[PDB]
Design a protein around this ligand. Sequence first.
Ligand SMILES: *C(=O)C[C@H](O)CCCCCCC
Length: 9
Amino acid sequence: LXXXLXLXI
Ligand SMILES: *C(=O)C[C@H](O)CCCCCCC
């Protein structure tokens, strides 16, 4: 999901 929407996971 986009790396947790931007969390980078
Ligand atoms: C989107 O961000 C793809 C990621 O690789 C997987 C996210 C998994 C969410 C489950 C952990 C809360």
